[PDB]
């Protein structure tokens, strides 16, 4: 659920 920024 946490977005992977890269």
């Amino acid at each position, epitope marked *: 659920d*946490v977005v992977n*920024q890269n």
Partner: antibody, heavy 120, light 113 residues
Framework: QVQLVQSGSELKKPGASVRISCKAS????????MNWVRQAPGQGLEWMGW????????TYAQAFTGRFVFSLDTSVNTAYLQINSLEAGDTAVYYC?????????????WGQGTLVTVSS | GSQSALTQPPSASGSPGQSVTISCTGT?????????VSWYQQHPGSAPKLIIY???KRPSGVPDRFSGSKSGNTASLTVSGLQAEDEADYYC??????????FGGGTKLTVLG
């Protein structure tokens, strides 16, 4: 070691543009995201958004949509921030900050900051 | 600072050698929802420095006098064995379910005497 070295201080008038750089060394530049954080003199930290160093695609915080542009030159391991149509309230130190693996939401290494001063 | 998304006390104080704890209150969509709470230390004229990440982890080189925890929607930084050089501003941050980062307003930690 990991190091993020930013460009020098800027002194500008309202309406002008400025492009700040952040040159990354000591790790693979395109492996991790870059975040931008602003701090007005005497005030707290403000998250501006991030850029993916894989895609080049920027995502802006709501307060930083419109006049602010994140970009890259991956051939020289550099992230850039441009501010267009400068206003007095843009006076601040602007930091680049590396997104720590895995997801980039912890800022493990910071540039030294670039002061942008807008004289009114 | 008092209007920030995460709430920190504007000031905190301790004496040399004392332990002090400072809090960072968010919501179940950020501090209470994820384990991406960070703490940054900032001395005058210097960039922020990461001191705690993922609620309780410490970067290599950061003294073990700094520790972090959370309970519900409130994260806490503890500084034990306070030293004069710990006088600085401390900021918390968190990921949010909106795919953003929020910051606290900062706490100025004073070391009395």
């Amino acid at each position: 070691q990991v190091q993020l070295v930013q460009s020098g201080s800027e002194l500008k008038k309202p309406g002008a543009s400025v492009r700040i750089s952040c040159k990354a060394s000591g790790y693979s530049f395109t492996s991790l995201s870059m975040n931008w954080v602003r701090q007005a003199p005497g005030q707290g930290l403000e998250w501006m958004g991030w850029i993916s160093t894989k895609s080049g695609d920027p995502t802006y915080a709501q307060a930083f949509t419109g006049r602010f542009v994140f970009s890259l030159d991956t051939s020289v391991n550099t992230a850039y921030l441009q501010i267009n149509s400068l206003e007095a309230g843009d006076t601040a130190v602007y930091y680049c900050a590396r997104g720590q693996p895995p997801v980039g939401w912890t800022f493990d290494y910071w540039g030294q900051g670039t002061l942008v001063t807008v004289s009114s | 600072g008092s209007q920030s998304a995460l709430t920190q006390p504007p000031s905190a104080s301790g004496s040399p050698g004392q332990s002090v704890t400072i809090s960072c209150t968010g919501t179940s969509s950020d501090v209470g929802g994820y384990n991406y709470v960070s703490w940054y230390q900032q001395h005058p004229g210097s960039a922020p420095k990461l001191i705690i990440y993922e609620v309780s982890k410490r970067p290599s080189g950061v003294p073990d006098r700094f520790s972090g925890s959370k309970s519900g929607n409130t994260a806490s930084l503890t500084v034990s064995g306070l030293q004069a050089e710990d006088e600085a501003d401390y900021y918390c941050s968190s990921y949010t379910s909106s795919s953003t980062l929020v910051f606290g307003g900062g706490t100025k930690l004073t070391v009395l005497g």
